[PDB]
Design a protein around this ligand. Sequence first.
Ligand SMILES: CCNC(=O)CCNC(=O)[C@H](O)C(C)(C)COP(=O)(O)OP(=O)(O)OC[C@H]1O[C@@H](n2cnc3c(N)ncnc32)[C@H](O)[C@@H]1OP(=O)(O)O
Ligand SMILES: CCNC(=O)CCNC(=O)[C@H](O)C(C)(C)COP(=O)(O)OP(=O)(O)OC[C@H]1O[C@@H](n2cnc3c(N)ncnc32)[C@H](O)[C@@H]1OP(=O)(O)O
Ligand code: FES
Lengths: 388, 388
Amino acid sequence: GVTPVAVMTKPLPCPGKCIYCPTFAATPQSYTPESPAVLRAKSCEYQAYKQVALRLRIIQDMGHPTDKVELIIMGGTFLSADITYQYGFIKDCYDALNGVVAGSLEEAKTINETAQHRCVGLCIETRPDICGKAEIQRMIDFGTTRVELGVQMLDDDIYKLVERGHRVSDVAEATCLLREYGLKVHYHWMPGLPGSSPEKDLALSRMVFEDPRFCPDGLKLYPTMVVEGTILEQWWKEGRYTPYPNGTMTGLIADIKALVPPYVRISRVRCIREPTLRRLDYPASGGKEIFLSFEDASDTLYGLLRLRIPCASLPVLGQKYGAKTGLVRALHVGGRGLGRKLLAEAECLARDEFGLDSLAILSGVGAREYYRSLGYELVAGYMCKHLD
Amino acid sequence: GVTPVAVMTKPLPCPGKCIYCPTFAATPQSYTPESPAVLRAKSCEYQAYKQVALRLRIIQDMGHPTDKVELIIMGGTFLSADITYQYGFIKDCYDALNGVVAGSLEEAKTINETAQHRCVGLCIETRPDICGKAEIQRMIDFGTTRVELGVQMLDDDIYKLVERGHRVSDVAEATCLLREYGLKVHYHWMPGLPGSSPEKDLALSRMVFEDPRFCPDGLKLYPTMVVEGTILEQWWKEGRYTPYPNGTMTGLIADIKALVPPYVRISRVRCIREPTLRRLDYPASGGKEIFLSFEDASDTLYGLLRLRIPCASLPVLGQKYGAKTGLVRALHVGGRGLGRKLLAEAECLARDEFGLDSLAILSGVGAREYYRSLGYELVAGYMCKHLD
Ligand SMILES: CCNC(=O)CCNC(=O)[C@H](O)C(C)(C)COP(=O)(O)OP(=O)(O)OC[C@H]1O[C@@H](n2cnc3c(N)ncnc32)[C@H](O)[C@@H]1OP(=O)(O)O
Ligand SMILES: CCNC(=O)CCNC(=O)[C@H](O)C(C)(C)COP(=O)(O)OP(=O)(O)OC[C@H]1O[C@@H](n2cnc3c(N)ncnc32)[C@H](O)[C@@H]1OP(=O)(O)O
Ligand code: FES
């Protein structure tokens, strides 16, 4: 029951230095120019406060709730701009949610912990090669809870729809780091990219879900299509690219959804979307991932929890919570008890089965109060508990 | 007294996968379209045999000698094409020099060891990121003796005149490998690139000659200028780039030439171009470089020898020449005795001062016979001697 508030960043230059590169970097929304959010963003001159305020007005006019919100920074190039711009943009978002201006970002965050519109999640689109330790540290300062990597398709010989492009190595290194810091990892997935087949697309889709370097929490399926007035259109006119027949495409995405394991949230534009407690383990980036969930005999999902046994404790946790610290990466229950039941199970598994010294939860600022009522305390952006 | 025979490779696609990239990769000759060799290359449909044959006819018509030749493969993208194309292109070159067709590349090489037109050197333009162990191994099969890296300018934030561009890391890794295999290393150098200053250009030029990761054997100075009908021209029209004033440029290249150490061959488009034996040492890519030379009281250069004490013996030398092997990377004497005198000194320094087990010389095929007359024997493309 979380409402998404998606805003765009201002057009930025290409992160890489190249005279062949375009003036402005390529965004995932370059081939979706008619999305309401994109159209609104342009109308507001890409102002953070103006966008969030306007989007709250639309949601309220529709009669939808706004007490639980997930901010979504769209662009994929956000983390490569001026540091002043990044923090300023985020600070604007929280101010709009709070309805009051603060003196700094951290003040706005702490204010949102108890405001009408809780920011229980904050997602940031970024690219595989723009997602290192430096970039991740900033996302913690923003209160980030989820990341969408512009993977698009998993092969270094398939043309990506952005400038330069990335390597598979960059995807694995970013995915590993994101997990070691307690973040959600979602991949942008778009079959039909130049230099690929319906076979290769589906092949790579099976690999990513049975390859420990990857195995994301969800996919955002972007069916590739020739939007007019774009580079890809030039290739269509020139016969250098031919889209998958409409019937073919609808068939391919269907096969993709079937491959997906149970722990994966398929997003679009078997999958996620009395009950008993279910458990599912799988390796990922060296460590172990534990997918807890509440489901009934009909296999309908009621709530989930993502517990990770990490390889290392990269977080800069306090002196008491030293080494041997586990990470609760997610906890969604779309409201009577399932929450604490799931969190209680994860605590024991970390103490009894893996002998971990404590747990840490990279929660959203608007959800911190929830974990406070269960014995957790804020430490360097994380909600922690000694766990005995 | 070596005659250069410069030929171009066929237009190739961009090594990297990018929809923004151009149709054909960018070459160093894209901003020098009026060079005789470029104009001839287009006229011959970029055929290797046709180019080399025609160039031999021109040189003979001018009355210049052709008994000593250096082949120069121009393009910078050669090593990224079909392996069949690469070996075929090289094999064509040797056939034209020999005046006779052979059954394979190796047969053409061995034939050129004794032909009228000796191929005493073979240079290949390549890019910093297209110069790994795999790429270098092929260049040995071709009989390569020198490499020109498209460094252009040494900063990851300066726009290069090719697509994608490279990092400084790629330049250091390529330079290290090239040295460990006994090759000459020359850098393409062009001040005036978008996003730079006459100050930054000269600053970086001082660094490269006092930084162990670099210190090339020579620079090929490409004064940047706005050739009509090019990307850079678009930037000039759009005021996004302004060239260095003509007077400024001539001044900057002058300051560059003064910085240069004594071991460096400044090429254009203190520097190189009775006598006693001179010695000069300097670190480079972990190992040690020894620059021997014959010069007189007036400091006029008569001949040089480049001896390297490598960190490791990456070459795949025979069983007798095991570890502890030195590399003679160059030996030029622009003809009574200086040659063997220089080579004798290097042999002793390798045996007495550095206790090396043997020496190896990555000579050109047309020069192998020279080293045979001094006790060296061919082994995996190198001319080797046990050295006792
Ligand atoms: C990736 C993590 N994302 C989030 O936590 C934000 C989305 N939140 C949710 O999906 C679910 O509300 C939760 C994960 C918080 C679990 O809530 P659920 O009701 O299913 O289980 P619980 O047994 O813990 O009951 C929730 C209690 O905390 C309250 N609560 C719900 N959300 C919040 C919140 N963000 N902050 C503080 N309190 C909350 C509820 O009001 C309730 O208390 P109440 O009955 O007195 O009103
Ligand atoms: C990077 C290395 N590049 C090369 O070796 C190719 C360019 N060659 C040169 O610059 C010079 O000719 C050399 C490096 C070979 C040194 O020659 P230099 O005459 O100065 O010293 P030397 O005392 O060794 O005398 C050279 C002898 O070898 C002969 N010679 C010269 N070049 C070659 C050659 N490529 N192959 C076989 N023999 C040669 C000469 O004819 C002479 O013998 P000769 O007097 O009976 O005719
Ligand atoms: S155009 Fe900048 S990398 Fe292809």
